[PDB]
Amino acid sequence: AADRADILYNIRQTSRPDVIPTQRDRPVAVSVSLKFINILEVNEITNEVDVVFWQRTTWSDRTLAWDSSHSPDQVSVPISSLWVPDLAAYNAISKPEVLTPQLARVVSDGEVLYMPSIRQRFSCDVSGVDTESGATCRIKIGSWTHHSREISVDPTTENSDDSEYFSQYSRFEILDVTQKKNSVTYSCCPEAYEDVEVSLNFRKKGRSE
Amino acid sequence: AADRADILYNIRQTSRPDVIPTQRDRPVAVSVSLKFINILEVNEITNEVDVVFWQRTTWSDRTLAWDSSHSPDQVSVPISSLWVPDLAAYNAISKPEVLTPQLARVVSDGEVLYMPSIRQRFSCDVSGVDTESGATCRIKIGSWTHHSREISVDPTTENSDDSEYFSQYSRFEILDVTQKKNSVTYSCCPEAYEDVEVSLNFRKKGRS
Amino acid sequence: AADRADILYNIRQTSRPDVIPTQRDRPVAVSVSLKFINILEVNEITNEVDVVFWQRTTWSDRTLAWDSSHSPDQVSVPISSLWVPDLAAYNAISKPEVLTPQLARVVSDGEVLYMPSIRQRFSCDVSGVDTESGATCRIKIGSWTHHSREISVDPTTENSDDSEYFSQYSRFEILDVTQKKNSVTYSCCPEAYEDVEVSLNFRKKGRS
Amino acid sequence: AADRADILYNIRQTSRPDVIPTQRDRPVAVSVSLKFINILEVNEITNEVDVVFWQRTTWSDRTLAWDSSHSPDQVSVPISSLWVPDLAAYNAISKPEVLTPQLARVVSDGEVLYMPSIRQRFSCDVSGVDTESGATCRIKIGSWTHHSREISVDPTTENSDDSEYFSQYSRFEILDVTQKKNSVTYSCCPEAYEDVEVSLNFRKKGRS
Amino acid sequence: AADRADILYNIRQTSRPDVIPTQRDRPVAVSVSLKFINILEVNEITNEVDVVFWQRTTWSDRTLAWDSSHSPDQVSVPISSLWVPDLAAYNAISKPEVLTPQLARVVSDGEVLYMPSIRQRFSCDVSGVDTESGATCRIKIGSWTHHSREISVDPTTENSDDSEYFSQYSRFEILDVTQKKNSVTYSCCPEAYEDVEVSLNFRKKGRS
Numbered sequence A: 001a002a003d004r005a006d007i008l009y010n011i012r013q014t015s016r017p018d019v020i021p022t023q024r025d026r027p028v029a030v031s032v033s034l035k036f037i038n039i040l041e042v043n044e045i046t047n048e049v050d051v052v053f054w055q056r057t058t059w060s061d062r063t064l065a066w067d068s069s070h071s072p073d074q075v076s077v078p079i080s081s082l083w084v085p086d087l088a089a090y091n092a093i094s095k096p097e098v099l100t101p102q103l104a105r106v107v108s109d110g111e112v113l114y115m116p117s118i119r120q121r122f123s124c125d126v127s128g129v130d131t132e133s134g135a136t137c138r139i140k141i142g143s144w145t146h147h148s149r150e151i152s153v154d155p156t157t158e159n160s161d162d163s164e165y166f167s168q169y170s171r172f173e174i175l176d177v178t179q180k181k182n183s184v185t186y187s188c189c190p191e192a193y194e195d196v197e198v199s200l201n202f203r204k205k206g207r208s209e
Numbered sequence B, C, D, E: 001a002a003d004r005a006d007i008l009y010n011i012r013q014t015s016r017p018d019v020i021p022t023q024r025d026r027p028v029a030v031s032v033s034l035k036f037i038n039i040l041e042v043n044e045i046t047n048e049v050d051v052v053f054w055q056r057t058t059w060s061d062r063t064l065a066w067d068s069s070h071s072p073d074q075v076s077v078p079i080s081s082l083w084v085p086d087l088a089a090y091n092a093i094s095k096p097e098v099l100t101p102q103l104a105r106v107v108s109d110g111e112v113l114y115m116p117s118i119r120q121r122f123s124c125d126v127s128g129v130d131t132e133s134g135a136t137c138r139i140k141i142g143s144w145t146h147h148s149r150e151i152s153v154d155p156t157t158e159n160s161d162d163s164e165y166f167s168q169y170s171r172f173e174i175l176d177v178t179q180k181k182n183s184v185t186y187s188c189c190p191e192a193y194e195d196v197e198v199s200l201n202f203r204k205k206g207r208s
């Protein structure tokens, strides 16, 4: 029976923040899911939007695993003590402003969960934001330097409440949110990079009828 | 015969800033209490507020205790040399801007006290801010990754003037501040995260 | 008997930045004085001002003294190598923006001087700024975690012209500056905290 | 064999981030190509633009190479663990804002690849941005401290769509982009610094 | 023969970043010359100007010199591995924004050169900026903690095109620039601090 102090200790040794946990030669399965929390600055003229969302990220790193039959099977670890996916938002025009503590959750089986609350600005289609159908902003997130053979991002598509955690005090209301998996290759190079395309459909609230 | 130099050296030798000081399977009891110092910006249309407040935070970490019968029973320590609760404002739309030196106070009995002055923007109910009844902005502060079995958060509900340290130079005034213990559970997982619900009742000054 | 490289070497070998240089058991005498350089942005509606000033900070650290009979009696040192008072502006609404190199001047007798140029925004009485009597903005600076028995702050009773280094290109002009010593206590805790209350009376330049 | 960890451990072990990987006294062949992703702020009065581009930079560091006959031939590495060309946008008026993970790609032959997405503001000709001819903003990128003998910069001449990865939601559109190799020289010294002069022909998307 | 790696290492193992490289008692002779590259945010009401310039800074450290008969006679070295003059713009109202790689240049003879391109806001005379005579903004740069005995600054007095590198796309133009040597003392202290007073005479471009 070991305590949390040891669990972190053994992790800080078997872990490599800059080494992708590629088991055998299969890519790392990275699950990416966003939970829109608020929509703030929207400019239909420039087509830019400021969003706040919880980026639920999940992946596995066996090396971290440990016996929890008589010990804690989950601990909070600083992301800098672990390896994390170099995920990026392709159409982002500002760097992610992480608002919460940068701690990840690690389970004795190696499963890793990281869910930061992020404030970021995007360049997307904002036209129709002040119309009934609303506007649909597409966010593309995926690894930046790890192609499909190294990292495979897949959205945890599961019928959930889109505006479930959305601020009721927002000026906008969520009409719908669909998250589709996609892949991007580049004419120069053979490898392709997987990504998740999150489509955010929203409109202004209190519009005349 | 110990001194401040030694008290610190010891904390360095025993403190595990990245490991929650959990005794047995008993969650670390964290006490949180906000003290509104100022309200800088308020948007009646976007329901957003920019405020300044002291966030009094307390918890125990016996592994840092020491005999103070022959030396100071308290010293200032950089929070980076100590474990700190990963508290967060669930409804904050900006990262916390700490305006004060990031030092905590550690008492010979292991008691830890951290009270930084913070400026932060939040998303809450601003309606009625211009009336006599004022608005009620509710702020939720609780652990971000540690649940009830690991961390517990209870407000320091006592008697004092809600606006006892509030700038008299603000455009607003505090009518009342109430802080209650709350809980947050997410649809996916049974685990629950304790938090403190801070309700700020304020209105614009000079209710014409 | 030595060079500047030796002096600095010893300082790093004996100095402990996270330990206040308490001599015996008496509080560390920290002297604080502000020499206003500019008044940039002002808002009489929100009662906020942006200010640039030199925060002349002084105190003593005996654990750094050295024989200078045949060696330099003074050297510039990175504040990150020395212990520095955890001063703060109580009514500041933005963290201090240090504009100058963060080097302190250490004397062979243990005297330490740190005078950074700082730009910071404060919440204070800006009313009457466009009048003849002008406005009086009071700035309060004192230790954040060290109470009176650990740190005492007092203004340098040295005389000098207030708008001496004040930019003549500022839209405003300094009418007077009084730096009073003060103490604060909190209904929760016995210990009190010292601070220097700097009242800056200024106004928008008129004409004729 | 040699898993990714062995390679990364080796690179970390042999990498000299502060030394230029000069084969003989041949300068280092650095290639840079900009992929304009968006044009955000544009001011024809001040001749200032805010652009987002992927600055594809490539060079070689033979000392990093390793045998990949039965091991990974490419890995992602933090640029902090590698030497990087000290490129600068001569006509930039803001420090480069890297929006992506600062990781490069290292190939078993020593080929280093780094392609950050950068948002930056430049001072260039903006006049005509509203006409059909559009405006022609020219950006000059090159080493800042290393001249032609130490570092050479050549554009990856490869006919591809200029606005291939240009946001369709931008108020502007790309007319044509030319990345010509150029050079610079300062009146003082003979040393000439190689650069890449990128001419961006863009205009505001009219009503369509 | 020595490669760049051996040169750097010798430098690193003998440079003292926090120790002023004094020779005997004499002061370290630092040369400061500014090359205005652009003028941006200008305000005659607030008397503030935004300016971009190259701050060519030169000094020597003979302890770093080496034999370059058959080895590189110059190398680029990170300013963090070397001691750098703690220069500061006395009338700057914003911290300096360094737009370029923070790399210095060390010559085999001990000469050290550092020329960062800096963007920074200043408080100076802006009156008449829209007149024919234009305006004259005076920038004062010089050591912050080192007095005349430890550091001395000499303006690079040499006939050269003032707007040689000045942006043509700027909304303003340089009428003339003068870099004189100045000295400063404070009623408290006998020592003086040398500096270089740069007087930029510019105006708003027009058509005639």
Ligand SMILES: O=[N+]([O-])/N=C1\NCCN1Cc1ccc(Cl)nc1
Pocket (backbone or CB within 6 Å): A054, A103, A104, A105, A113, A114, A115, A116, B144, B145, B186, B187, B188, B189
């Ligand atoms: O399951 N959840 O939705 N959890 C959740 N939403 C907001 C905060 N939170 C708890 C949590 C759980 C795990 C990690 Cl790594 N961070 C945060």
Ligand SMILES: O=[N+]([O-])/N=C1\NCCN1Cc1ccc(Cl)nc1
Pocket (backbone or CB within 6 Å): B054, B103, B104, B105, B113, B114, B115, B116, C144, C145, C186, C188, C189, C193
């Ligand atoms: O109890 N208090 O309200 N204390 C208090 N308010 C402003 C400054 N201050 C002193 C203090 C006490 C303890 C810590 Cl960790 N930080 C600061």
Ligand SMILES: O=[N+]([O-])/N=C1\NCCN1Cc1ccc(Cl)nc1
Pocket (backbone or CB within 6 Å): C054, C103, C104, C105, C113, C114, C115, C116, E144, E145, E186, E188, E189
């Ligand atoms: O005595 N002074 O007023 N000194 C002073 N005013 C502006 C700059 N300066 C020099 C100085 C002296 C000592 C230190 Cl630690 N920093 C700066």
Ligand SMILES: O=[N+]([O-])/N=C1\NCCN1Cc1ccc(Cl)nc1
Pocket (backbone or CB within 6 Å): A144, A145, A146, A186, A188, A189, A193, D054, D103, D104, D105, D113, D114, D115, D116
């Ligand atoms: O060739 N590309 O255009 N590649 C590319 N564009 C966006 C992301 N990406 C992949 C990539 C691969 C390697 C490096 Cl060092 N940077 C980026």
Ligand SMILES: O=[N+]([O-])/N=C1\NCCN1Cc1ccc(Cl)nc1
Pocket (backbone or CB within 6 Å): D144, D145, D186, D188, D189, E054, E103, E104, E105, E113, E114, E115, E116
């Ligand atoms: O004017 N110059 O001699 N050189 C120069 N101007 C802008 C860039 N540059 C090259 C250079 C030369 C030396 C150093 Cl330390 N940095 C940069």
